[PDB]
Amino acid sequence: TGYDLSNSVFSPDGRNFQVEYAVKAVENGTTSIGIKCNDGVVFAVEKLITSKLLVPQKNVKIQVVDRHIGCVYSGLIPDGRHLVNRGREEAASFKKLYKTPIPIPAFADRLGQYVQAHTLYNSVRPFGVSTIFGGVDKNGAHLYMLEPSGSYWGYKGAATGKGRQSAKAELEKLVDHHPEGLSAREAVKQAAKIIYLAHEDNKEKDFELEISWCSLSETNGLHKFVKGDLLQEAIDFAQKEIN
Amino acid sequence: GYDRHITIFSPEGRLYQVEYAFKATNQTNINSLAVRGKDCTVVISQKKVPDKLLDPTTVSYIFCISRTIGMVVNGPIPDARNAALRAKAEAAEFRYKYGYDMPCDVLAKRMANLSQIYTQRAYMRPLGVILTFVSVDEELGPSIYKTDPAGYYVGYKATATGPKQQEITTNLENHFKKSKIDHINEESWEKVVEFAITHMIDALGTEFSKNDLEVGVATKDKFFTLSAENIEERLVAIAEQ
Amino acid sequence: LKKGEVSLGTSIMAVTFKDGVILGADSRTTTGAYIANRVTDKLTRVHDKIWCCRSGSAADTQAIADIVQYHLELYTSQYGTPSTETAASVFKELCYENKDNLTAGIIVAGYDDKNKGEVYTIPLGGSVHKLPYAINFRENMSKEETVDFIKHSLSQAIKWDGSSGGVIRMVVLTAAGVERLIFYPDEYEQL
Amino acid sequence: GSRRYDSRTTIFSPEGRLYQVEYALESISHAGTAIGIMASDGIVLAAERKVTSTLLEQDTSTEKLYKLNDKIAVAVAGLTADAEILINTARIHAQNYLKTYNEDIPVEILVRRLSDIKQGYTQHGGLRPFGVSFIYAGYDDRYGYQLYTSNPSGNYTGWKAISVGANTSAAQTLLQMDYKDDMKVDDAIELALKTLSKTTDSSALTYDRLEFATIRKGANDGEVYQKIFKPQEIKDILVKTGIT
Amino acid sequence: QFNPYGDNGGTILGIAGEDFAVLAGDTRNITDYSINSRYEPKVFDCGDNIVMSANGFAADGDALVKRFKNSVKWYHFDHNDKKLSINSAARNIQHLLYGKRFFPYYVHTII
Amino acid sequence: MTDRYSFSLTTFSPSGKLGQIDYALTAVKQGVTSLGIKATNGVVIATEKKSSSPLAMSETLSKVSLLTPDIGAVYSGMGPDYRVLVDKSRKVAHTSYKRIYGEYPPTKLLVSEVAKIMQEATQSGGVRPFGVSLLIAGHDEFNGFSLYQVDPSGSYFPWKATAIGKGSVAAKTFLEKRWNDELELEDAIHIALLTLKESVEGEFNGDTIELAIIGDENPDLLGYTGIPTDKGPRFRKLTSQEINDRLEAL
Amino acid sequence: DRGVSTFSPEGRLFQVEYSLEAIKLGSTAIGIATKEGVVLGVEKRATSPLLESDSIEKIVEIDRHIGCAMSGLTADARSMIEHARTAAVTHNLYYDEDINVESLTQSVCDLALRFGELMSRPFGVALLIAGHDADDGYQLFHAEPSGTFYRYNAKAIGSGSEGAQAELLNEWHSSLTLKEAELLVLKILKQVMEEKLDENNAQLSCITKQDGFKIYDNEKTAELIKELKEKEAAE
Amino acid sequence: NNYDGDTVTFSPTGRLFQVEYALEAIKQGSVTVGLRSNTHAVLVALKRNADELSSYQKKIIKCDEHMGLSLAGLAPDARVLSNYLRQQCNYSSLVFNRKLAVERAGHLLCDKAQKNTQSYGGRPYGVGLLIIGYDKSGAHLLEFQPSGNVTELYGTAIGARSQGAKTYLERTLDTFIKIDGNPDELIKAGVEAISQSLRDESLTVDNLSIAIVGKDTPFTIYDGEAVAKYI
Amino acid sequence: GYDRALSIFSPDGHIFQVEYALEAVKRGTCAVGVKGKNCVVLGCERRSTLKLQDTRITPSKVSKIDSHVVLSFSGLNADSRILIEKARVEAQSHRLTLEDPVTVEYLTRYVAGVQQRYTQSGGVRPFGVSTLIAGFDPRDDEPKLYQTEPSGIYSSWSAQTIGRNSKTVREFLEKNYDRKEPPATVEECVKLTVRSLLEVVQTGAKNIEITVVKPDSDIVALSSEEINQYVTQIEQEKQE
Ligand SMILES: [Cl-]
Ligand SMILES: [Cl-]
Numbered sequence A: 001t002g003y004d005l006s007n008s009v010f011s012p013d014g015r016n017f018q019v020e021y022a023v024k025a026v027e028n029g030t031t032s033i034g035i036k037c038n039d040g041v042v043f044a045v046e047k048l049i050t051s052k053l054l055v056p057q058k059n060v061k062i063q064v065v066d067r068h069i070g071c072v073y074s075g076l077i078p079d080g081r082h083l084v085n086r087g088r089e090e091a092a093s094f095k096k097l098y099k100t101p102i103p104i105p106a107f108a109d110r111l112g113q114y115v116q117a118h119t120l121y122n123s124v125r126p127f128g129v130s131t132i133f134g135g136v137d138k139n140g141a142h143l144y145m146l147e148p149s150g151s152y153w154g155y156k157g158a159a160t161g162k163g164r165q166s167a168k169a170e171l172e173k174l175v176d177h178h179p180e181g182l183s184a185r186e187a188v189k190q191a192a193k194i195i196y197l198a199h200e201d202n203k204e205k206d207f208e209l210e211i212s213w214c215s216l217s218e219t220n221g222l223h224k225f226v227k228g229d230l231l232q233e234a235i236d237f238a239q240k241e242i243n
Numbered sequence B: 001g002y003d004r005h006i007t008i009f010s011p012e013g014r015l016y017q018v019e020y021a022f023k024a025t026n027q028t029n030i031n032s033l034a035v036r037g038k039d040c041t042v043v044i045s046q047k048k049v050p051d052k053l054l055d056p057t058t059v060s061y062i063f064c065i066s067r068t069i070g071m072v073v074n075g076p077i078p079d080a081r082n083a084a085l086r087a088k089a090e091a092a093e094f095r096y097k098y099g100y101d102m103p104c105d106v107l108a109k110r111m112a113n114l115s116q117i118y119t120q121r122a123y124m125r126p127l128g129v130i131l132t133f134v135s136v137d138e139e140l141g142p143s144i145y146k147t148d149p150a151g152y153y154v155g156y157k158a159t160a161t162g163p164k165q166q167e168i169t170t171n172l173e174n175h176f177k178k179s180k181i182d183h184i185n186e187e188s189w190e191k192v193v194e195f196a197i198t199h200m201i202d203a204l205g206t207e208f209s210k211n212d213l214e215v216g217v218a219t220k221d222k223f224f225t226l227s228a229e230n231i232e233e234r235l236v237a238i239a240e241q
Numbered sequence C: 001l002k003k004g005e006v007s008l009g010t011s012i013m014a015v016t017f018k019d020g021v022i023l024g025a026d027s028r029t030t031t032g033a034y035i036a037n038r039v040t041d042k043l044t045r046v047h048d049k050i051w052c053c054r055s056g057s058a059a060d061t062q063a064i065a066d067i068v069q070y071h072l073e074l075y076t077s078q079y080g081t082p083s084t085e086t087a088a089s090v091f092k093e094l095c096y097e098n099k100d101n102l103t104a105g106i107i108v109a110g111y112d113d114k115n116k117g118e119v120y121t122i123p124l125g126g127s128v129h130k131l132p133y134a135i136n137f138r139e140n141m142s143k144e145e146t147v148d149f150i151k152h153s154l155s156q157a158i159k160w161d162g163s164s165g166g167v168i169r170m171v172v173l174t175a176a177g178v179e180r181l182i183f184y185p186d187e188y189e190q191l
Numbered sequence D: 001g002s003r004r005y006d007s008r009t010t011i012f013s014p015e016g017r018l019y020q021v022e023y024a025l026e027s028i029s030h031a032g033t034a035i036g037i038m039a040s041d042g043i044v045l046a047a048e049r050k051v052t053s054t055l056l057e058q059d060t061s062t063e064k065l066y067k068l069n070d071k072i073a074v075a076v077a078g079l080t081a082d083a084e085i086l087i088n089t090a091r092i093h094a095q096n097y098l099k100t101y102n103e104d105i106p107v108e109i110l111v112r113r114l115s116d117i118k119q120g121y122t123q124h125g126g127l128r129p130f131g132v133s134f135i136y137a138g139y140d141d142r143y144g145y146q147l148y149t150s151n152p153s154g155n156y157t158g159w160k161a162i163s164v165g166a167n168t169s170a171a172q173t174l175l176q177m178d179y180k181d182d183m184k185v186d187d188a189i190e191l192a193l194k195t196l197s198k199t200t201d202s203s204a205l206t207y208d209r210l211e212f213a214t215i216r217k218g219a220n221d222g223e224v225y226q227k228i229f230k231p232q233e234i235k236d237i238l239v240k241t242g243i244t
Numbered sequence E: 001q002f003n004p005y006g007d008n009g010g011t012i013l014g015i016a017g018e019d020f021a022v023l024a025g026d027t028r029n030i031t032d033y034s035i036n037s038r039y040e041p042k043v044f045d046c047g048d049n050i051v052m053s054a055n056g057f058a059a060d061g062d063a064l065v066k067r068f069k070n071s072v073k074w075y076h077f078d079h080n081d082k083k084l085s086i087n088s089a090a091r092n093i094q095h096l097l098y099g100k101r102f103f104p105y106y107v108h109t110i111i
Numbered sequence F: 001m002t003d004r005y006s007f008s009l010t011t012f013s014p015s016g017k018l019g020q021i022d023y024a025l026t027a028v029k030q031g032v033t034s035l036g037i038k039a040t041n042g043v044v045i046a047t048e049k050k051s052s053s054p055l056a057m058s059e060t061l062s063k064v065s066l067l068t069p070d071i072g073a074v075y076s077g078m079g080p081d082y083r084v085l086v087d088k089s090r091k092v093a094h095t096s097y098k099r100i101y102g103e104y105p106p107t108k109l110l111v112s113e114v115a116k117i118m119q120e121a122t123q124s125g126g127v128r129p130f131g132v133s134l135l136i137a138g139h140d141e142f143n144g145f146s147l148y149q150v151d152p153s154g155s156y157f158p159w160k161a162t163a164i165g166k167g168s169v170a171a172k173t174f175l176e177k178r179w180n181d182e183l184e185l186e187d188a189i190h191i192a193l194l195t196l197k198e199s200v201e202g203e204f205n206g207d208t209i210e211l212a213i214i215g216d217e218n219p220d221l222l223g224y225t226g227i228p229t230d231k232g233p234r235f236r237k238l239t240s241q242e243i244n245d246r247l248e249a250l
Numbered sequence G: 001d002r003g004v005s006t007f008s009p010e011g012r013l014f015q016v017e018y019s020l021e022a023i024k025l026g027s028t029a030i031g032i033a034t035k036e037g038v039v040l041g042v043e044k045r046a047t048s049p050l051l052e053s054d055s056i057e058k059i060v061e062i063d064r065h066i067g068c069a070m071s072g073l074t075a076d077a078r079s080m081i082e083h084a085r086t087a088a089v090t091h092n093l094y095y096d097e098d099i100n101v102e103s104l105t106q107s108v109c110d111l112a113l114r115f116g117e118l119m120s121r122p123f124g125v126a127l128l129i130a131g132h133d134a135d136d137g138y139q140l141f142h143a144e145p146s147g148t149f150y151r152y153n154a155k156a157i158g159s160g161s162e163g164a165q166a167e168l169l170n171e172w173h174s175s176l177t178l179k180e181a182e183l184l185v186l187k188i189l190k191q192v193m194e195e196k197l198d199e200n201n202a203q204l205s206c207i208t209k210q211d212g213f214k215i216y217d218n219e220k221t222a223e224l225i226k227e228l229k230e231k232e233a234a235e
Numbered sequence H: 001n002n003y004d005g006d007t008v009t010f011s012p013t014g015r016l017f018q019v020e021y022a023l024e025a026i027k028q029g030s031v032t033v034g035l036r037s038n039t040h041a042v043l044v045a046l047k048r049n050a051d052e053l054s055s056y057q058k059k060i061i062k063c064d065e066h067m068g069l070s071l072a073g074l075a076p077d078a079r080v081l082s083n084y085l086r087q088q089c090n091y092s093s094l095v096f097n098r099k100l101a102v103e104r105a106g107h108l109l110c111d112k113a114q115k116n117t118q119s120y121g122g123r124p125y126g127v128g129l130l131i132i133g134y135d136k137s138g139a140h141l142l143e144f145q146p147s148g149n150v151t152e153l154y155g156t157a158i159g160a161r162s163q164g165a166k167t168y169l170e171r172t173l174d175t176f177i178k179i180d181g182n183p184d185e186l187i188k189a190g191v192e193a194i195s196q197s198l199r200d201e202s203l204t205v206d207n208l209s210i211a212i213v214g215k216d217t218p219f220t221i222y223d224g225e226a227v228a229k230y231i
Numbered sequence I: 001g002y003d004r005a006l007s008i009f010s011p012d013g014h015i016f017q018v019e020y021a022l023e024a025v026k027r028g029t030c031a032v033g034v035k036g037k038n039c040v041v042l043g044c045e046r047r048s049t050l051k052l053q054d055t056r057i058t059p060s061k062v063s064k065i066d067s068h069v070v071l072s073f074s075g076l077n078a079d080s081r082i083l084i085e086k087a088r089v090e091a092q093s094h095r096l097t098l099e100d101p102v103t104v105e106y107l108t109r110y111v112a113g114v115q116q117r118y119t120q121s122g123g124v125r126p127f128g129v130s131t132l133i134a135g136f137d138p139r140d141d142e143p144k145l146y147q148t149e150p151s152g153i154y155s156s157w158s159a160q161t162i163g164r165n166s167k168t169v170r171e172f173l174e175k176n177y178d179r180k181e182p183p184a185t186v187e188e189c190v191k192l193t194v195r196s197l198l199e200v201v202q203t204g205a206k207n208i209e210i211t212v213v214k215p216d217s218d219i220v221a222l223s224s225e226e227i228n229q230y231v232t233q234i235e236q237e238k239q240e
């Protein structure tokens, strides 16, 4: 055999084992989710508090691309940052040439093509992150999720990390119970709950919640972090649901 | 056995990486079909959306390469999109350099030559996809040209691709034995789509709803995909006969 | 402008109106005092409903317009139909970065369904300016009024400028589609 | 990365040998025998074609003997395709020299440069060496008639008579036995053919399985002529010496 | 045609004593017949008890001073916070200036 | 990133064999039978059109290719490798000859250029040899008619007649019996069709057989008149109908 | 095989650790630093008696105020010395002054790890760099192929290094004179050398503020060897 | 085992062994401690020597007037990363007349280390860094690991037996965080923290190394007799 | 470009590629260098398995680098040509910039530096060649003899040998060569060189090459008959 030792090598199955091995690193990472809503998107992430010595609110994992796109990821954090840095260059050159800010589907492909490129050669390693991202453009709200293979799809709700199955199950219930749509302020509250429910699969260390959102009405189509009263309101809502 | 890891010859004269790239083609478990009318070329593909959280409008293996050319892919979506983007760039460059729209067969050959390079050059892996190009060419008329990981390509009267490709192929073979012609003798593209869907139902033995199918249609001077309601309207016509 | 090369004059205009936008121009092309082409088409298509008016160097404006058409064809394949603003940006990007070697004055005009009729002018420097019209106009004129406005305006330019002449070509951009108009000397001269 | 698939063509064995050069020489030993014999008034080049087929076009063919310029020729033993790459380089080098100095290139200079190219492939680049051994036969106004050989190592030596390819052990013994210094071209021609006739792996040596050439001063007054033998001319010389 | 140089006027003066040294300069900045600033310093403390002025074309003077200041900073990093002697700074500035021998800094420099 | 394969993938084994070339020749052996026969007033090249599927249009896939107006090529082995070689062969005929001398190259030199390209794939970094053997038929003023074989190694040999691929051993034996130096072009075409019937198993007609000739000049195929020296291409691909006519009197 | 810049499970670079084994095979080199100067001494170790020992150059001048002794694959040191000399002279050109011994050493050590897949392997040679500057005075540095350098009061490198270093541990004190240091190098060299120590198979050198770096003559060293033997027999 | 030949290879369980082996080089390295209050940030480092005749390896490096770090592991790698920080701090000053944020400093280091873990040929950095600084948002302490992971902390420690000092700081968290406007007391807390990682050896005058930065205090390193106060 | 590190360290601290390059030298024909009071002599073995050779045109074992310096070698013949060419270019380059021909030490140091560079450069193997470089510095009458080897180390020798069975001839020279009193004349130096080769060679016919170098660019190669006279003289004195 030895098919799994090198990237970009097809096994007899037709599989790239190195990419599947990269997925294991994503599964090992903390839980992160994305919720599409009426006029925007909401992102949330589980931050494991390894120690008391960690400064609260000052290890921000969610990143902004341009002024209208939000990115969150699970797995190897540095790999996620590298991908976002590329995304920012892609979005910058798009706006430079075409004036208009990059559309989300356009942006999604720019990342997708880049991640896929890292499965074409043995001289590079695949990305050890699944990336949930999206925002608001001229055509409305969009949520995406991108995997180590370069595969991505549009989503109503997205989840990845160690508590992905728990989060997915909870996301599926929202889609069923809200066919006409979920509001932006509701999605923030639901996002908090789902992270707290998904924390049951990572309950040794206690955690810190971090939420962001894009919304045509609430944030004026721009990406902003959920802070202060709105954040604490969402935490209290989640605390009430687990008990 | 490193002759199975990169694209070099085995003792029996084979490229195992090319052969394994063919097996990656069926990884999506989707079957596609392409047929030609008089004025049009229709391509249909199964649409499977297993996850409930997915946005079904974004799940597509059919691409609009140029205004005139359409392409359906059998294989993983990352390699599919890789091929799509390249074909789009090639079709656009062609028009700029040579002053006319790139023909379907020329694009197919170009993409096939790129695929061939991956079978000879070691650092590049083959794409695990089969590309089916369709158009209504201004010189050759309705056209179907298909490319694979080996760098092979050829024109088709009709064609099928996927896990249950053989069952669809023989179904179509038996029809053209009977009709005694190279195409679907039909005026409107609407009925050519109805033919395509009907014969896929017979071959695969499954029934289809509006969301189980994905349809692309090539006419003169434009290629376009059908919406769920366009397909639904089409499925109603089949059922009422 | 290089010596002896083909000049496109400068009698071009684009006017926005109720239903969309209209581009207008003459048909004269010179090499000194010699009219190289008297039936030139200075109204060029870069996309289905995005057109431009060319002025200055014919060679330069053609090369640019060809490149822009390439970029918008590739844009459309990936990201869907582009905006008139996007088209103007690509023109500018070319005219601005290569300002030392070019002599191109371009007016970009297009029709969206959201934005309706838009007009962008791109002078020699490589700057962009969005306007209601470009070269006593009222906003939201009718098609017939805007035609008469362009007709009367270019008619006078031809009358006093030797770099201008021939026929008056016009292109109408609306939700209905694309309409080409033409007006001969016997009609416009005696206005 | 790619390190996994690298054969490392340019390295030493524990014994201090270049693996690929040694294996290239093994390849050459299965190639058709080529003999060069230097006389006082000319040089002979003889070579055996590799198992000829009856439908092979013999007259318009060139497998073993090639012309580098008007005064220099080579006999090939090994991969023909590899040799042609090297031959075109050698032809160009000879013309560069003529362009620069307005004088025909001295034989050794051409041989050294071609041998230096081979050497390069054994020391750097990571590519396989050229699986080719040459016999250079040529003339210049400094040393007169000269025979050289080069091999994949890039090492070249001068000879009075030499063989390359298959059965060089047996061939070199026979040449060492019957060769002498005051020999004429016509005698060397006979020695070359007799040697091939005994060392050949074929049943009997025939005109269609041979390539032959001479470099004489047989032209009119103080000038060198290259004669690449035609099929009929080989047939005649083979009868004249009493082999067929 | 584009002239990359200009004259920002001003004049500077450096006198050396026994145990001290002064570097003076007017604070007026000008172009042609106009006054740009009545107080625009052009004598700077560059560290290690070195004062510097690059008078002439202000853009080149500011760039040179800025580079020398940065040269002092990296001298400390690379040489264990050693103090840059005035003679060593002089030789360093020679190399900064001559490095642009074919597109000079239009300044008269005094330290 | 970047092509890190800057080293040879083809190397000498202890026995002196170049494995990848041998294995490429093995791939040629598996390939479909093609052949070439040289006559006094022309050359013929032929091959079976092995159809991958009956739904496929075998007309679109051309195994026999025009390289210059007076030179044609056919192959046995891997089709995709052949296709790109034809593209490179056509281009090199222009860049390295026609754009210099204002005329098309003679058969032997074009063959030499193709052989060079195939030799490079045998020695250059990060590539495998081409898995094809070419038969190149052509004509030029000073050498007349000629037929060359080109192998994966880059070695080329001139032939009076030969065959390559699946049933080449038997086909070459058949050609030895039938070939003589007084053959006319029509006689060579006849022999080519006889030889090819032995190797072909299924259907044997103008739709399953591809056949071209290098013969007389064709003014009707030139596309213009007015220049006396320009008399038209000597390469001509026989039509499906033209083949079937000769199969009746077989 | 395996990568050149690979880490072992223990957390060390294989190639750097293997180059250290090559340095252990090398001939002995000893350096001792005092307040009156720094002394550098080396074992020449001629492979045959026909070899002219004076041509064995294992002690080298970098600048007037900096000297250098080597041990291991001594051919690898040539480019290191060339770099050091250029660095020293270049710094004088830019700053009209002598360059600090530590800065010079740091410049040499920057080359060390500039290898991988830059040069193909680490250096197979260790250097004792000795010198003087106005700031930190007399200094002795040990520059390894790992890119690390330690300052030392005394240091031995080469085949007899562990034995000689233990001896330097006991013998060294802060009030050593230059003459005492010279004899101490010769004493310890004679102990760890295979062949018997004399002026031909061993070499001495020193660096002082006043006279700069100086390699000793065989005549001068011979007298110090004779002085050494008499002092040991004296008690 | 088979998946540790280079950094470009993932193990079946999703691990990067070369990065983990680079992490192992930090554990072998000498202990260094970092901690901060609201006004000041302090680095305390236990320097290591080859033997009694040798000097003690310098652990602390200055990056700008308001920033610097301590190292643990391969010292040459720290020199490369610290030099990169110096340039980035310097770029911010020359171009934007702006002191580089300590958070951005961490982001830049993370991205530089990451590129070395995804490409063939190169290797991960074999050093862990503790960056301290004082910028427009007060005092900061960062922990850099060569995997790329950078973490902002109140206090931490890295190196051999660093768990002892890290446990102490975790207990002392509430005390030392409020040492505002008092440099000497913050250092004392750091010296007592690093003392929890000592075995057999104790803190001497040429062994201990301390650095500090704060509100009205430029980044300054204390060695030799200057640290005798804190023993 | 091909980048592979071919020359690398092993666990025991050896660079096998450099050591295997020495094995290639050990396989090469024997070469000897002996320096007298006012001359240096370079002796070289030529293996006698090669008959039918053309000695006029065959590359000579001893090569002139400049009019005053010569270079012989043992090991791979093809490799030696690359070093010789580089040396010859550097010799002219030195004359052009310094306005003075190279010293023997300088030329040796250059060649040795080239050899060393190939032991730690990517994509190349070491030279399978050891050289003996000999001559006289400009305006100097002191004989110089240096040796180089694949690793890149070089050194001066009163007398030295390299190649196959070099340990036997080195054994001979070690007892026969006196440091206090070297060969006073050209004849004495040549005789000792021939004697030392006769311990190894086989026959003293066309197997031994001798080249004598003297001060002020005075270099001459001995013919067969001239060398044969030394062989005849030594054998008669041996029978005693
Ligand atoms: Cl192509
Ligand atoms: Cl125009």
Ligand SMILES: [Mg+2]
Residues within 6 Å of the ligand: B062, B063, B064, C077
């Ligand atoms: Mg599409």
Ligand SMILES: [Mg+2]
Residues within 6 Å of the ligand: B006, B007, B118, B119, B120, B121, B122, B123, B124, B125, B126
């Ligand atoms: Mg490949």
Ligand SMILES: [Mg+2]
Residues within 6 Å of the ligand: C158, C159, C160, C161, C162, C163, C164, C165, C166
């Ligand atoms: Mg007019």
